[PDB]
Amino acid sequence: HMAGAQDFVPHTADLAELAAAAGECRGCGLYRDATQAVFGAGGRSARIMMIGEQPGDKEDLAGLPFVGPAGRLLDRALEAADIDRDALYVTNAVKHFKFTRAAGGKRRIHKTPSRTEVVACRPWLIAEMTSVEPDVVVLLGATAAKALLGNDFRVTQHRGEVLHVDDVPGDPALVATVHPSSLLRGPKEERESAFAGLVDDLRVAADVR
Ligand code: SF4
Numbered sequence: 001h002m003a004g005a006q007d008f009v010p011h012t013a014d015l016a017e018l019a020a021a022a023g024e025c026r027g028c029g030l031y032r033d034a035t036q037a038v039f040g041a042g043g044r045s046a047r048i049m050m051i052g053e054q055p056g057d058k059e060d061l062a063g064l065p066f067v068g069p070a071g072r073l074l075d076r077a078l079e080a081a082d083i084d085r086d087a088l089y090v091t092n093a094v095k096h097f098k099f100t101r102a103a104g105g106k107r108r109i110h111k112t113p114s115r116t117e118v119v120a121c122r123p124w125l126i127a128e129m130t131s132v133e134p135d136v137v138v139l140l141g142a143t144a145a146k147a148l149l150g151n152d153f154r155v156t157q158h159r160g161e162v163l164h165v166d167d168v169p170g171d172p173a174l175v176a177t178v179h180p181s182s183l184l185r186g187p188k189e190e191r192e193s194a195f196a197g198l199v200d201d202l203r204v205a206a207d208v209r
Pocket residue numbers: 004005022025026027028029030031037094095096120121124
């Protein structure tokens with residue numbers, strides 16, 4: 001248990017115990033500056049798991065995943081797909097906010113977790129997957145997609161595709177889609193196109209049998 005977060009992950013599938021243990025994780029350096037660990041949220045009967053990159057500024061203080069503008073956009077997209085809450089477990093590839101500030105900024109600015117951090121934190125993701133046994137996993141953005149599909153995976157090339165990789169416990173369906181935060185910037189028309197495609201991918205996931 002010498003690698004990354006491995007020794008911090010208890011031998012239990014209980015999400016409450018997992019979240020408590022993740023609160024004490026020192027498996028990479030990100031715990032130092034962040035406020036708290038942000039574990040995933042939902043229950044183990046969920047059939048759809050969603051994985052973002054990391055808790056953001058709001059998530060870091062809320063102690064819950066997907067609470068910012070990007071979570072609100074995600075809510076809009078789940079609505080437009082016909083996805084119910086009880087079906088969902090939502091979490092992040094890295095579970096401590098990695099960040100910096102810029103003078104005059106209105107928020108703390110997220111920084112991209114390195115591959116080393118993603119791999120160090122992945123024992124938690126594996127624990128969550130084995131705990132939840134989802135039918136499908138939605139990977140929201142490149143960091144999360146690469147966490148499970150390989151450092152060379154390209155989200156832009158596999159949109160709407162149902163993927164299956166044989167080193168993911170329980171062989172769930174996998175669907176890689178856009179980083180919802182990316183849909184906050186830019187021309188309305190392209191944000192609307194992007195939103196429709198995210199809904200497309202969520203429907204694809206929700207229809208996995
Ligand atoms: S990011 Fe993941 S591995 Fe690094 S300290 Fe936080 S929980 Fe542990």
